[PDB]
Ligand binder design. Structure first.
Ligand SMILES: COc1cnccc1-c1c(-c2ccccc2)n(CCC(=O)O)c2ccc(C3CC3)cc12
Length: 135
């Protein structure tokens, strides 16, 4: 039956992006990747089957898919080709995704706000906010 995470389930499309190029600079993304990545208007498809949550991104830049169980670390190859160790947890009603690689860490938090799914990507002191609405 229903879980709280079902608030995230569905098909979402990106409607606005603030400071993403600066976030990607902090992450260490190189120029050509930043330019083509920052142009993309991905769809994000989130589904839940038992204990497994799947988040897919479809765009003209890259399609990616992760499946995971909350609190259980997994390997992830990111859209910019970092190989990272990821763990995703739910804190209150916020999905918090921490990615670790090469001594560095970045946190992506996803939360519902009104009819939007707001994604906050933080690398040290730089925050990018990416807003999606239902497709
Ligand atoms: C341009 O962003 C994307 C384009 N196509 C597919 C996935 C993503 C992409 C995504 C993404 C998009 C939809 C669903 C799940 C994840 N994230 C997570 C943050 C975000 O929502 O933009 C990201 C965080 C950082 C980067 C930069 C490092 C390269 C790219 C992405």
């Amino acid at each position: 039956g229903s879980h709280m995470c079902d608030a995230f389930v569905g098909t979402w499309k990106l409607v606005s992006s603030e400071n993403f190029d600066d976030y990607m600079k902090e992450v260490g993304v190189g120029f050509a990747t930043r330019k083509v990545a920052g142009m993309a208007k991905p769809n994000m498809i989130i589904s839940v089957n038992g204990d497994v949550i799947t988040i897919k991104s479809e765009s003209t830049f890259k399609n990616t898919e992760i499946s995971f169980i909350l609190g259980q670390e997994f390997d992830e190859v990111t859209a910019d080709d970092r190989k990272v160790k990821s763990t995703i947890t739910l804190d209150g009603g916020v999905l918090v995704h921490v990615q670790k690689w090469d001594g560095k860490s970045t946190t992506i938090k996803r939360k519902r706000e009104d009819d939007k799914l707001v994604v906050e990507c933080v690398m040290k002191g730089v925050t990018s906010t990416r807003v999606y609405e239902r497709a």
